[PDB]
Amino acid sequence: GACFKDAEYIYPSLE
Amino acid sequence: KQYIFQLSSLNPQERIDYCHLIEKLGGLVIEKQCFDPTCTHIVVGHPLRNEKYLASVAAGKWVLHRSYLEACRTAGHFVQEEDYEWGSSSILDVLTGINVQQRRLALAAMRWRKKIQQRQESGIVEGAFSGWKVILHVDQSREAGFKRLLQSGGAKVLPGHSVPLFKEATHLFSDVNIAEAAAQNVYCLRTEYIADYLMQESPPHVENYCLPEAISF
Ligand SMILES: [K+]
Ligand code: NA
């Protein structure tokens, strides 16, 4: 995968 | 028995030193960047709500503070992990300060490790998403990271979103006919449910995550 790029992505939370 | 490590959020000199140390103590290092479920142990410089950390939690890995590897170096062998777990009272006492987000991620890693490893000791390996059969409906840029995170926790990701898949599906996550999926006993949920399921001390209320078209079911 685009692991280095995707690593930045913070998963969404209702918190 | 066979220790397999990945490293995250560490400085360069650390990374080189710890890879050298792990190999010297008879461990394997997975140097590739994406989470690899072959690993047993992950050493992370700080918790983050990202794919690599959340996948380690969903799989119930040891999520450890770097002081673990300093203790191993002094001993000359891999030592007992519990007092070096990010969520452990021993580490939370060790830190000068921790933000609420990082504390919650640290406690989540420990909670899932305890649950998954207690069952592993009894001869069953199941991740946080065991029994999930998932339809993904997200932006193409996000699809691969959601798939990797779900598979890390034991979920099956179904091939696409066509109606025949609604019978086996348990969950459909959207950032396709939603009302028909909901009518076929599929939880149709916003994507926030996945992180919140891993992070919250009790299972989130699905009603708070239910997609509009599914609210009736
Ligand atoms: K179903
Ligand atoms: Na590797």
Side-chain angles (χ1 to χ4, degrees), chain B residues 3-70:
Chain B
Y3 292 71
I4 303 175
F5 287 81
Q6 284 189 281
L7 307 178
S8 307
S9 297
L10 293 178
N11 79 44
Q13 201 275 347
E14 268 168 345
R15 182 158 32 63
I16 291 302
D17 170 27
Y18 289 155
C19 284
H20 182 84
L21 175 63
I22 290 162
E23 282 181 14
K24 171 183 175 169
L25 300 189
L28 170 60
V29 182
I30 299 174
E31 55 204 351
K32 285 175 200 309
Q33 180 69 13
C34 265
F35 173 78
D36 186 328
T38 310
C39 80
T40 59
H41 294 68
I42 190 164
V43 176
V44 306
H46 49 89
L48 280 169
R49 202 174 77 228
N50 71 356
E51 175 193 336
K52 193 173 193 182
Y53 189 88
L54 291 179
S56 305
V57 173
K61 305 306 186 184
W62 289 114
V63 178
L64 299 182
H65 185 266
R66 57 202 168 95
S67 62
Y68 177 68
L69 291 181
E70 299 300 333

Coordinates of all heavy atoms in Angstrom, one line a residue, chain B residues 3-70:
Chain B
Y3 N 9.9 -14.1 18.6 CA 9.5 -12.7 18.8 C 9.7 -12.0 17.4 O 10.8 -12.1 16.8 CB 10.4 -12.0 19.8 CG 10.2 -12.4 21.2 CD1 10.7 -13.6 21.7 CD2 9.7 -11.6 22.2 CE1 10.6 -14.0 23.0 CE2 9.5 -11.9 23.5 CZ 10.0 -13.1 23.9 OH 9.9 -13.5 25.3
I4 N 8.6 -11.3 16.9 CA 8.7 -10.7 15.6 C 8.2 -9.2 15.8 O 7.0 -9.0 16.2 CB 7.8 -11.4 14.6 CG1 8.3 -12.9 14.4 CG2 7.9 -10.7 13.3 CD1 7.5 -13.7 13.5
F5 N 9.1 -8.3 15.6 CA 8.8 -6.8 15.9 C 8.5 -6.0 14.7 O 9.2 -6.2 13.7 CB 10.0 -6.2 16.7 CG 10.2 -6.7 18.1 CD1 10.8 -7.9 18.4 CD2 9.8 -5.9 19.1 CE1 10.9 -8.3 19.7 CE2 10.0 -6.3 20.4 CZ 10.6 -7.5 20.7
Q6 N 7.6 -5.0 14.9 CA 7.6 -3.8 14.0 C 7.9 -2.6 14.9 O 7.6 -2.7 16.1 CB 6.3 -3.6 13.2 CG 6.3 -4.6 12.0 CD 5.1 -4.3 11.2 OE1 4.0 -4.6 11.5 NE2 5.3 -3.6 10.1
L7 N 8.4 -1.6 14.3 CA 8.7 -0.3 15.0 C 7.9 0.8 14.4 O 7.7 0.8 13.2 CB 10.2 0.0 14.9 CG 11.1 -1.1 15.4 CD1 12.6 -0.7 15.2 CD2 10.9 -1.5 16.8
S8 N 7.4 1.8 15.2 CA 6.7 3.0 14.7 C 7.0 4.2 15.5 O 7.4 4.1 16.7 CB 5.2 2.8 14.8 OG 4.8 1.6 14.2
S9 N 7.0 5.3 14.8 CA 7.1 6.7 15.5 C 8.4 6.8 16.3 O 8.4 7.4 17.4 CB 5.8 6.9 16.2 OG 4.7 6.9 15.3
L10 N 9.5 6.2 15.8 CA 10.8 6.3 16.5 C 11.7 7.2 15.7 O 11.4 7.4 14.5 CB 11.4 4.9 16.7 CG 10.6 4.0 17.7 CD1 11.3 2.7 17.7 CD2 10.5 4.6 19.1
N11 N 12.7 7.7 16.3 CA 13.7 8.5 15.6 C 14.7 7.6 14.9 O 14.8 6.4 15.1 CB 14.4 9.6 16.6 CG 15.4 8.9 17.5 OD1 16.3 8.2 17.0 ND2 15.4 9.3 18.8
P12 N 15.4 8.1 13.9 CA 16.3 7.3 13.1 C 17.4 6.5 13.9 O 17.6 5.4 13.6 CB 16.9 8.4 12.2 CG 15.8 9.4 12.0 CD 15.3 9.5 13.4
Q13 N 18.1 7.1 14.8 CA 19.2 6.5 15.5 C 18.6 5.3 16.3 O 19.1 4.2 16.3 CB 20.0 7.4 16.4 CG 21.4 6.9 16.7 CD 21.5 6.0 17.9 OE1 20.5 5.8 18.7 NE2 22.6 5.3 18.1
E14 N 17.4 5.6 17.0 CA 16.7 4.5 17.7 C 16.3 3.3 16.8 O 16.5 2.2 17.2 CB 15.3 5.1 18.1 CG 15.4 5.6 19.5 CD 14.2 6.5 20.0 OE1 13.3 6.9 19.2 OE2 14.2 6.7 21.2
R15 N 15.7 3.6 15.7 CA 15.3 2.6 14.7 C 16.5 1.7 14.4 O 16.4 0.4 14.5 CB 14.7 3.3 13.5 CG 14.2 2.3 12.5 CD 13.2 2.8 11.6 NE 13.2 4.2 11.2 CZ 14.3 4.8 10.6 NH1 15.3 4.2 10.2 NH2 14.2 6.2 10.4
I16 N 17.6 2.3 14.0 CA 18.8 1.5 13.6 C 19.3 0.7 14.8 O 19.5 -0.5 14.7 CB 20.0 2.4 13.1 CG1 19.6 3.0 11.7 CG2 21.3 1.6 13.1 CD1 19.3 1.9 10.7
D17 N 19.3 1.3 16.0 CA 19.9 0.7 17.2 C 19.0 -0.5 17.6 O 19.5 -1.6 18.0 CB 20.0 1.7 18.3 CG 20.4 1.2 19.7 OD1 21.0 0.1 19.8 OD2 20.0 1.8 20.7
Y18 N 17.7 -0.3 17.6 CA 16.7 -1.3 18.1 C 16.6 -2.5 17.1 O 16.5 -3.6 17.5 CB 15.3 -0.6 18.3 CG 15.3 0.3 19.5 CD1 14.3 1.3 19.6 CD2 16.0 0.1 20.7 CE1 14.3 2.2 20.7 CE2 16.0 0.9 21.8 CZ 15.1 1.9 21.8 OH 15.0 2.7 22.9
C19 N 16.7 -2.2 15.8 CA 16.7 -3.3 14.8 C 17.9 -4.2 15.1 O 17.8 -5.4 15.1 CB 16.8 -2.7 13.4 SG 15.2 -2.1 12.8
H20 N 19.1 -3.6 15.3 CA 20.3 -4.3 15.6 C 20.1 -5.1 16.9 O 20.5 -6.4 16.9 CB 21.5 -3.3 15.8 CG 22.8 -4.0 16.0 ND1 23.6 -4.6 15.0 CD2 23.4 -4.3 17.2 CE1 24.6 -5.1 15.6 NE2 24.6 -5.0 16.9
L21 N 19.6 -4.5 17.9 CA 19.4 -5.2 19.2 C 18.4 -6.4 19.1 O 18.7 -7.5 19.6 CB 18.8 -4.2 20.3 CG 18.5 -4.8 21.6 CD1 19.7 -5.4 22.4 CD2 17.8 -3.7 22.5
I22 N 17.3 -6.2 18.4 CA 16.3 -7.2 18.3 C 16.9 -8.4 17.6 O 16.6 -9.5 18.0 CB 15.1 -6.7 17.5 CG1 14.3 -5.7 18.4 CG2 14.2 -7.8 17.1 CD1 13.4 -4.8 17.6
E23 N 17.7 -8.2 16.5 CA 18.3 -9.3 15.8 C 19.3 -10.0 16.6 O 19.3 -11.3 16.7 CB 18.8 -8.8 14.4 CG 17.7 -8.5 13.4 CD 18.2 -8.0 12.1 OE1 19.4 -8.1 11.9 OE2 17.4 -7.5 11.3
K24 N 20.0 -9.3 17.4 CA 21.1 -9.8 18.3 C 20.4 -10.7 19.4 O 21.0 -11.7 19.7 CB 21.9 -8.6 18.9 CG 22.8 -9.0 20.0 CD 23.6 -7.9 20.6 CE 24.4 -8.3 21.8 NZ 25.3 -7.3 22.2
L25 N 19.2 -10.4 19.8 CA 18.5 -11.2 20.8 C 17.7 -12.3 20.2 O 17.0 -13.0 20.9 CB 17.6 -10.3 21.7 CG 18.3 -9.2 22.4 CD1 17.4 -8.5 23.4 CD2 19.6 -9.7 23.1
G26 N 17.8 -12.6 18.9 CA 17.2 -13.7 18.2 C 15.8 -13.4 17.7 O 15.1 -14.3 17.2
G27 N 15.4 -12.1 17.8 CA 14.1 -11.7 17.1 C 14.2 -11.4 15.7 O 15.3 -11.3 15.1
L28 N 13.0 -11.3 15.0 CA 12.9 -10.8 13.6 C 12.4 -9.4 13.6 O 11.5 -9.1 14.5 CB 12.0 -11.8 12.9 CG 11.5 -11.3 11.5 CD1 12.8 -11.2 10.6 CD2 10.5 -12.3 10.9
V29 N 12.9 -8.6 12.7 CA 12.3 -7.2 12.5 C 11.7 -7.2 11.2 O 12.3 -7.5 10.2 CB 13.4 -6.1 12.7 CG1 12.7 -4.7 12.5 CG2 14.1 -6.2 14.0
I30 N 10.4 -6.8 11.1 CA 9.7 -6.4 9.9 C 10.0 -5.0 9.6 O 9.5 -4.1 10.4 CB 8.2 -6.9 9.9 CG1 8.2 -8.4 10.1 CG2 7.5 -6.5 8.7 CD1 6.9 -9.0 10.3
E31 N 10.8 -4.7 8.6 CA 11.3 -3.3 8.3 C 10.3 -2.6 7.4 O 10.3 -1.3 7.4 CB 12.7 -3.3 7.8 CG 12.9 -4.1 6.6 CD 14.4 -4.6 6.4 OE1 15.2 -4.1 7.1 OE2 14.6 -5.4 5.4
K32 N 9.4 -3.3 6.7 CA 8.4 -2.7 5.8 C 7.4 -1.9 6.7 O 7.2 -2.2 7.9 CB 7.7 -3.7 4.9 CG 8.7 -4.2 3.8 CD 8.1 -5.3 2.9 CE 9.2 -6.0 2.2 NZ 10.1 -5.0 1.4
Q33 N 6.8 -0.8 6.1 CA 6.1 0.3 6.7 C 4.7 -0.2 7.1 O 4.3 0.2 8.2 CB 6.2 1.5 5.9 CG 5.5 2.7 6.4 CD 6.2 3.3 7.6 OE1 7.3 3.0 8.0 NE2 5.4 4.2 8.2
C34 N 3.9 -0.8 6.2 CA 2.5 -1.2 6.6 C 2.5 -2.2 7.8 O 3.5 -3.0 7.8 CB 1.7 -1.7 5.5 SG 0.7 -0.5 4.7
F35 N 1.5 -2.2 8.6 CA 1.3 -3.2 9.6 C 1.4 -4.6 9.0 O 0.7 -4.8 7.9 CB -0.1 -3.1 10.4 CG -0.4 -4.2 11.4 CD1 0.2 -4.2 12.6 CD2 -1.2 -5.2 11.0 CE1 0.0 -5.2 13.5 CE2 -1.4 -6.2 11.9 CZ -0.8 -6.2 13.2
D36 N 2.1 -5.5 9.6 CA 2.1 -6.9 9.2 C 1.7 -7.8 10.3 O 2.3 -7.8 11.4 CB 3.5 -7.3 8.8 CG 3.7 -8.6 8.1 OD1 3.0 -9.5 8.5 OD2 4.6 -8.8 7.3
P37 N 0.5 -8.6 10.1 CA 0.0 -9.4 11.2 C 0.9 -10.6 11.6 O 0.6 -11.2 12.6 CB -1.3 -10.0 10.6 CG -1.0 -10.0 9.1 CD -0.2 -8.7 8.9
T38 N 2.1 -10.8 10.9 CA 3.1 -11.7 11.3 C 3.7 -11.2 12.6 O 4.2 -12.1 13.4 CB 4.2 -11.9 10.3 OG1 3.5 -12.1 9.1 CG2 5.1 -13.1 10.6
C39 N 3.7 -9.9 12.9 CA 4.4 -9.4 14.1 C 3.7 -9.9 15.3 O 2.5 -10.2 15.3 CB 4.6 -7.9 14.1 SG 3.1 -7.0 14.5
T40 N 4.4 -10.0 16.4 CA 3.9 -10.3 17.8 C 4.0 -9.1 18.7 O 3.2 -9.0 19.7 CB 4.7 -11.5 18.4 OG1 6.1 -11.2 18.4 CG2 4.5 -12.7 17.5
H41 N 5.0 -8.2 18.4 CA 5.3 -7.0 19.3 C 5.5 -5.8 18.4 O 6.1 -5.9 17.3 CB 6.7 -7.3 20.0 CG 6.6 -8.4 21.0 ND1 6.5 -9.7 20.6 CD2 6.8 -8.4 22.3 CE1 6.5 -10.5 21.7 NE2 6.7 -9.7 22.7
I42 N 4.9 -4.7 18.8 CA 5.2 -3.4 18.2 C 5.7 -2.4 19.2 O 5.1 -2.4 20.3 CB 4.0 -2.9 17.4 CG1 4.4 -1.7 16.5 CG2 2.8 -2.5 18.2 CD1 3.4 -1.4 15.4
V43 N 6.8 -1.7 18.9 CA 7.3 -0.7 19.8 C 7.1 0.6 19.1 O 7.5 0.8 18.0 CB 8.8 -1.0 20.1 CG1 9.4 0.2 21.0 CG2 9.0 -2.3 20.8
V44 N 6.4 1.5 19.9 CA 5.9 2.8 19.2 C 6.3 3.9 20.1 O 6.3 3.8 21.3 CB 4.4 2.8 18.9 CG1 4.0 1.6 18.0 CG2 3.6 2.9 20.1
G45 N 6.8 5.0 19.4 CA 7.2 6.2 20.2 C 6.1 6.9 20.8 O 6.3 7.6 21.9
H46 N 4.9 7.0 20.1 CA 3.7 7.6 20.7 C 2.5 6.9 20.1 O 2.5 6.7 18.9 CB 3.8 9.1 20.6 CG 4.1 9.6 19.2 ND1 3.1 9.8 18.2 CD2 5.3 9.8 18.6 CE1 3.7 10.2 17.1 NE2 5.0 10.2 17.3
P47 N 1.4 6.7 20.9 CA 0.2 6.3 20.2 C -0.4 7.3 19.3 O -0.4 8.5 19.6 CB -0.8 6.0 21.4 CG 0.2 5.9 22.6 CD 1.3 6.8 22.3
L48 N -0.9 6.8 18.2 CA -1.7 7.6 17.2 C -2.9 6.8 16.7 O -2.8 5.6 16.6 CB -0.8 7.9 16.0 CG 0.2 9.1 16.1 CD1 1.2 9.0 15.0 CD2 -0.5 10.4 16.3
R49 N -3.9 7.6 16.4 CA -5.2 7.0 15.9 C -5.0 6.7 14.4 O -5.9 7.2 13.6 CB -6.4 7.9 16.3 CG -7.7 7.1 16.2 CD -8.8 8.0 16.8 NE -9.2 9.0 15.8 CZ -9.4 10.3 16.1 NH1 -9.1 10.8 17.3 NH2 -9.9 11.1 15.1
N50 N -3.9 6.1 14.0 CA -3.6 5.8 12.5 C -3.8 4.3 12.3 O -4.0 3.5 13.2 CB -2.3 6.4 12.1 CG -1.1 5.7 12.6 OD1 -1.2 4.8 13.5 ND2 0.0 6.2 12.2
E51 N -3.6 3.9 11.0 CA -3.9 2.6 10.6 C -2.9 1.6 11.2 O -3.4 0.5 11.8 CB -3.7 2.6 9.1 CG -3.9 1.2 8.5 CD -3.4 1.1 7.1 OE1 -3.4 2.1 6.4 OE2 -3.1 -0.1 6.7
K52 N -1.7 1.9 11.3 CA -0.7 1.0 11.9 C -0.9 0.7 13.3 O -1.0 -0.4 13.8 CB 0.7 1.5 11.7 CG 1.8 0.5 11.9 CD 3.1 1.0 11.6 CE 4.1 -0.1 11.5 NZ 5.5 0.5 11.2
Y53 N -1.2 1.8 14.1 CA -1.5 1.6 15.6 C -2.8 0.8 15.7 O -2.9 -0.1 16.6 CB -1.5 2.9 16.3 CG -1.6 2.8 17.7 CD1 -0.5 2.8 18.5 CD2 -2.8 2.7 18.4 CE1 -0.5 2.6 19.9 CE2 -2.9 2.6 19.8 CZ -1.7 2.5 20.5 OH -1.8 2.4 21.9
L54 N -3.9 1.3 15.1 CA -5.2 0.7 15.3 C -5.2 -0.7 14.8 O -5.8 -1.6 15.5 CB -6.3 1.5 14.6 CG -6.6 2.9 15.2 CD1 -7.6 3.6 14.4 CD2 -7.0 2.8 16.7
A55 N -4.5 -1.1 13.8 CA -4.4 -2.5 13.3 C -3.7 -3.3 14.4 O -4.2 -4.5 14.6 CB -3.7 -2.5 12.0
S56 N -2.7 -2.8 15.0 CA -1.9 -3.6 16.1 C -2.9 -3.8 17.3 O -2.9 -4.9 17.8 CB -0.7 -2.8 16.6 OG 0.2 -2.5 15.5
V57 N -3.7 -2.8 17.6 CA -4.8 -3.0 18.7 C -5.8 -4.1 18.2 O -6.1 -5.0 19.0 CB -5.4 -1.7 19.0 CG1 -6.6 -1.8 19.9 CG2 -4.4 -0.7 19.5
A58 N -6.3 -3.9 17.0 CA -7.4 -4.8 16.5 C -6.9 -6.3 16.5 O -7.7 -7.2 16.7 CB -7.8 -4.4 15.1
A59 N -5.6 -6.5 16.3 CA -5.0 -7.8 16.3 C -4.5 -8.2 17.7 O -4.0 -9.3 17.8 CB -3.8 -7.8 15.4
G60 N -4.6 -7.4 18.7 CA -4.2 -7.7 20.1 C -2.7 -7.9 20.2 O -2.3 -8.7 21.1
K61 N -1.9 -7.2 19.5 CA -0.4 -7.3 19.7 C 0.0 -6.6 21.0 O -0.7 -5.8 21.5 CB 0.3 -6.7 18.5 CG -0.1 -7.2 17.1 CD 0.0 -8.6 16.9 CE -0.2 -9.2 15.5 NZ -0.2 -10.7 15.5
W62 N 1.2 -7.0 21.4 CA 1.9 -6.2 22.5 C 2.3 -4.8 21.9 O 2.9 -4.8 20.9 CB 3.2 -6.8 22.9 CG 3.1 -8.1 23.7 CD1 3.4 -9.3 23.4 CD2 2.6 -8.1 25.1 NE1 3.2 -10.2 24.5 CE2 2.7 -9.5 25.5 CE3 2.1 -7.2 26.0 CZ2 2.3 -9.9 26.8 CZ3 1.8 -7.6 27.3 CH2 1.9 -8.9 27.7
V63 N 1.7 -3.8 22.4 CA 2.0 -2.4 22.0 C 2.9 -1.7 23.2 O 2.3 -1.5 24.2 CB 0.7 -1.6 21.7 CG1 1.0 -0.2 21.3 CG2 0.0 -2.4 20.6
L64 N 4.1 -1.6 22.9 CA 5.1 -1.4 24.0 C 5.8 -0.1 23.9 O 6.1 0.5 22.8 CB 6.2 -2.5 23.9 CG 5.6 -3.9 24.1 CD1 6.7 -4.9 24.1 CD2 4.8 -4.0 25.4
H65 N 6.2 0.4 25.1 CA 7.1 1.6 25.2 C 8.5 1.2 24.9 O 8.9 0.1 25.2 CB 6.9 2.2 26.6 CG 7.6 3.5 26.8 ND1 8.9 3.5 27.4 CD2 7.3 4.8 26.6 CE1 9.3 4.7 27.4 NE2 8.3 5.6 27.0
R66 N 9.3 2.1 24.3 CA 10.7 1.9 24.0 C 11.6 1.4 25.2 O 12.6 0.7 25.0 CB 11.4 3.1 23.3 CG 11.4 4.4 24.1 CD 11.5 5.6 23.2 NE 11.2 6.8 24.0 CZ 12.1 7.6 24.6 NH1 13.4 7.3 24.5 NH2 11.7 8.6 25.3
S67 N 11.2 1.8 26.4 CA 11.9 1.3 27.6 C 11.9 -0.2 27.7 O 12.8 -0.8 28.3 CB 11.3 2.0 28.8 OG 10.0 1.6 29.0
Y68 N 11.0 -0.9 27.0 CA 11.0 -2.4 26.9 C 12.3 -2.8 26.3 O 13.1 -3.7 26.8 CB 9.9 -2.9 26.0 CG 9.9 -4.4 25.8 CD1 9.7 -5.2 26.9 CD2 10.3 -4.9 24.6 CE1 9.7 -6.6 26.7 CE2 10.4 -6.3 24.5 CZ 10.1 -7.1 25.5 OH 10.2 -8.5 25.5
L69 N 12.7 -2.2 25.2 CA 14.0 -2.6 24.5 C 15.2 -2.2 25.3 O 16.2 -3.0 25.3 CB 14.0 -2.1 23.1 CG 13.0 -2.7 22.2 CD1 13.0 -2.1 20.8 CD2 13.1 -4.3 22.1
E70 N 15.2 -1.1 26.1 CA 16.3 -0.8 27.0 C 16.4 -1.9 28.0 O 17.6 -2.3 28.4 CB 16.1 0.6 27.6 CG 16.1 1.7 26.5 CD 17.3 1.8 25.7 OE1 18.4 1.4 26.2 OE2 17.2 2.1 24.5

